[PDB]
Structures are given as structure tokens and as C-alpha cells.
Design a protein around this ligand. Structure first.
Ligand SMILES: [Cl-]
Lengths: 315, 311
């Protein structure tokens, strides 16, 4: 491989959900702020996003994390997150991945740090055992006990809540919450999403409810909390979902079922788990989400100019 | 644990070739080695081919010394559910990987699998040709009622896997239509099962092929293939293209030696041809692979998914 563009990346996952941290070989995006860099990326280097995050090198679940020098001097790195369709702002699981990646590279040590994104700087903490805690945006419940009739299923009740995204959170599912049921769970949650849209059920100020969360239990009779989360691309979250867990904490807090400072353990569909807690803040809560990430590969992505899909498979 | 791998794709369908770091499987025949991999080292299959490192589309290709001294390598192919025998797109990937590593040069070569040695040829321009197993049509004009689409007619054919092959498509054959095409072909599969329609000896028909045309008005042949785990093949599908050649042959639509150009859902293409063989045909399939990454897989003992995510 001498004929090929090389991109150095470290892959990890955060409770099952993958992050690809880009270390070297990426074109320079200029000396503007991170949002200016994100727009330069979008306008002039979009083929690089697809090369890294779309098939065949990436997938529908992959988030890329491009490291850049921080412009906020209180931050240990800047980052731009992206995926197989476009560019993100903040990304919880990806931030946990970035933190653990930097730690494994020897670039940061345990303690408090900050991560700068195009839409602001996120506070994080790295524990001696590698646990990463992140501060989620303020979360709250917009409506409780909303009912929608779901074709092929029946009446479904849930809460509408903001965790940094809009969620409909229901306790009802037509099967066990396990990986073996993902296709059925995906179809069911997609039907809920469509039914909500058709019924005109939205978040505040007409916000589209584009995340669906089933808040149930692990199917081992333990009664442990487990969720399933359908993300906007019709892909399920392999992790317990930071924003979705934060939205759940907001509902627990509003119902008086979880106290300030009290720990909440949330499994996701794979049985991996996040820890959540909150402090009361305004009309809602300030959530703190803790999770683990593990490095899965160190790679040189190789881009062969003769490859018809050199820059990724794109419809 | 560190595992050295080279990732490639063949017409869009990925292969992960394992070069170093994999446990020794012992000195028996390759089929014994595969059985030892299955019984004693199955966590390594999932670590390499399941999420988070792998995917529903990923085939792993473990290189090991051949027992056939005329072969340039032995290989065991596997995926996120189990073990394979032969693998067309994977073999194209292995050949191009060996070539890019400088271990073989253009010309004829042989690749030993647990179920036989496969003859291959690497052209100067990088095209790899492989011999597919004998292929034949089992049943012509099989038909199922598919909710929402009425009656769907097709052939049941063997290309190394069982295929139902229909010319009936519900929409254009493009990547933008993959969800719709997946739903349609899944419904076909379920209807065949419900009806008790099988291949020879009750063989489950677990691959569904739409044989149609490109949506760009070119008239070019293009397919969509649903694989057993309900993922579509990103490539034109070697065994599925071979099964198509067998039907063309049986209907006298393709002559021995005549080239057949087959696009898959992404518009990438394989070339097929055949010569007659017993009740069927001996197909030859050609395509291209490109290297996409060189990687060290890293397995952290503390990682709950160290050895992959498994149902
Ligand atoms: Cl409002």
C-alpha cells in the first residue's frame, strides 16, 4: 500500500455503540472556530466523512470523531462528530469514546476535563477505573401519559420528554427486550414514531419526536431496568443512550420516583449499562451519565484511487 | 490480544483477512481445523466478525498453511453467525490481499478451503476469476402469493446456496430502495417456507434473488439478493449469479462460453460464464476487490464485549 491516502483511526465502543476517533491523515480545516471547521468539512471535504463513516469502512451505527486543536483553552481537545449521513453537534457515547481514547494514548490522566464541540464545551470526568461521566444537557418532561393508537399493535401510552433529543418513552413492548428481538422492536417503535407524527403529537414548539424509547426490564426476571431506543436513522442504539436515559431520569424525577443524587442503573438492549443521576435544575434536571468504553482496534484506513467506492458507498 | 487483519471489499461486500494473532488450530485437514475453531475457539469468530468490530455483512477469512501443497494458502471463512465452506467474494478478497502484500503475482493460483481447493486467476488489471461449484436449476416456475404483491413466480436453483430467483420487482433496483426490497424479499422467503417449498431434500430456500435491470435506463442486468440473516448482499452475489447462469443455461438463453455481465444493487458488477457439467453447469465468476484498511484488532480483557456482541 503505497498508492493510497492513509487515515489513522482508533476504534472503540461505548457500552456497544461504536466511535471512530480520527488521529491523523485528515485534511486541514483551517483556523476558524469549530463550527466554521464543521462547515468547511461539510462543504469542501464531505467525501472524507463518507470514506470514514459510510460502508464499507463504516456502518449505519458508526460515529466518527475528528480530533482538532481546541479553541477553548479549558478543553483538552476539540472534536467534530459525524456519521454516515451528516454532521452532529454533541454526542454522548462518542464523547465517552474520545475520553477513553485520549487516556489510552497517554494524552490525559484521570480527573476532570472538558471536550470542545462545534456547539459548546462539555464537562467530563475520568475515573481511575476508566469510567467516564458526562454532563448531559438540561432535561425535562413535556407531557405525561400520552396515548397513541399504533396500527398492527394497539393503544400505546408513554411520556414525551427532552433529554437533548425528543423522546416518546413507553413501558409497553410486544416482546422481550433482547438483541434477538431487535427486528421486531425496530418495526414496533417505527410504527409508534409514524403514529405519533400522524396524530400530531410533538414536543414543545412542535418539535418532532424522532427518538422512541421502550423503558422496560431485562428479560431474566431480575427486574433490572433495560431499554430499547430507536434513533432517527431507523437504527437502534446499541448503548443505553445518554440522552434517552437523561429523558428517563427527567420522568422519574417528575414522578418523584428518583431523588436528587440517587443512582439509577440503566441497561440498554445488549445488557450493558449506564449509571445516571441528577440535580434539580429549573423546570427539569441536570443529568450526569456515566459509562465505559473499550478500544477495539487501531487502524490505518486506506483509500485506493482505483476503488469505485474509495470515498464510501452513498445512495 | 492483538489480531493483524486487512479489510477489503469485493464489489461492496466486505472481507476481513486474518494475517496474524489467531490461535493455532493444529495439524489435521482443514475441515478438522474448522471444527476445532468451532468447538474450542468460537469466541475468536465473534470477536472478529460480530459487532462491534464486525457486522451482518462481514466475512472473515483466516489464513493458515495449506494441506494441499499446490495451494498458495489455506483459508477458513466465517461470519457473525457461524462457519462457511467456500466463499466467492471472500476468495476474491483473499487473492487481492495476497497480491497487494506481494505474496502472489498475476496468473493462476489455488486457494484451499475446508471443502476443497478452488482454482482462481489474477489478471494484470487485478480482476480475480473464481470457479464456482456446479450449479443447476431444481424447479422452474414455482409460485407463492405474497401479501401486497399478488403472485410471485420464480425458479428454485442451486449455486452453492439455495435461491429463489424472480424477475418481478416492486420498485427500482437501487440502494435508495433497499428497505422496500428487503421487506418484499423477506415476505417471499416466508411464503415459500409457509408453503413447504424447498430445495432438494427439504433444503431451506434462504437466499432470495430479484433478477432485474438497472434503474438508469441502460437496460443492464442488475439484481438484489437477500441473504440468510436478512441483510442484502452489497455485491452481485457469486453463488446467486451462478444460480442465475444455471437457469439461463437451462432455458437456452446463454451459450457455453458467453459472458454475462451482472450488476448488484450498488451498480458494481461481476462477469459470469459457464461450461456444461453433469446435470448443471460449471460457472466461473470474475470481479474486483479493493483494500480498505490495515488494522490491529485489540481485545481488552475488561471489555464485556471483548469477544463480540452475541444474541
Ligand atoms: Cl408548547
Amino acid at each position: 500500500f503505497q498508492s493510497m491516502h492513509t487515515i489513522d483511526v482508533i476504534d472503540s465502543h461505548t457500552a456497544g455503540e461504536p466511535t471512530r476517533v480520527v488521529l491523523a491523515g485528515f485534511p486541514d480545516l483551517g483556523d476558524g472556530d469549530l463550527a466554521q471547521c464543521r462547515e468547511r468539512f461539510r462543504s469542501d471535504f464531505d467525501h472524507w466523512r463518507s470514506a470514514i463513516a459510510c460502508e464499507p469502512r463504516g456502518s449505519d451505527t458508526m460515529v466518527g470523531a475528528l480530533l482538532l486543536p481546541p479553541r477553548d483553552p479549558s478543553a483538552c481537545t476539540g472534536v467534530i462528530f459525524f456519521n454516515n449521513v451528516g454532521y452532529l453537534g454533541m454526542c454522548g457515547h462518542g464523547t465517552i469514546g474520545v475520553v477513553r481514547t485520549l487516556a489510552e494514548l497517554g494524552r490525559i490522566a484521570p480527573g476532570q476535563h472538558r471536550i470542545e464541540t462545534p456547539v459548546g464545551t462539555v464537562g467530563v470526568a475520568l475515573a481511575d477505573d476508566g469510567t467516564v461521566s458526562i454532563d448531559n444537557v438540561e432535561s425535562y418532561r413535556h407531557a405525561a401519559g400520552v396515548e397513541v393508537d399504533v396500527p398492527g399493535h394497539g393503544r400505546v401510552r408513554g411520556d414525551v420528554a427532552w433529554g437533548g433529543n425528543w423522546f416518546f418513552i413507553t413501558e409497553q413492548a410486544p416482546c422481550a427486550l433482547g438483541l434477538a428481538q431487535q427486528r421486531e422492536l425496530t418495526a414496533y417503535t417505527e410504527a409508534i414514531r409514524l403514529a405519533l407524527e400522524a396524530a400530531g403529537i410533538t414536543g414543545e414548539a412542535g418539535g418532532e419526536i424522532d427518538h422512541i424509547e421502550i423503558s422496560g426490564v431485562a428479560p431474566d426476571g431480575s427486574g433490572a431496568a433495560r431499554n430499547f431506543v430507536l434513533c432517527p436513522g431507523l437504527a437502534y442504539d446499541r448503548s443505553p443512550c445518554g440522552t434517552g436515559t437523561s429523558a428517563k431520569l427527567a420522568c422519574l424525577a417528575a414522578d418523584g420516583k428518583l431523588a436528587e443524587g440517587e443512582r439509577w442503573l440503566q441497561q440498554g438492549i445488549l445488557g450493558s449499562a449506564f449509571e445516571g443521576s441528577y440535580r434539580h435544575s429549573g423546570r427539569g434536571i441536570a443529568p450526569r451519565i456515566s459509562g465505559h468504553a473499550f478500544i477495539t482496534a487501531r487502524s490505518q484506513l486506506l483509500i485506493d484511487p482505483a476503488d469505485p467506492f474509495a470515498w464510501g458507498i452513498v445512495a
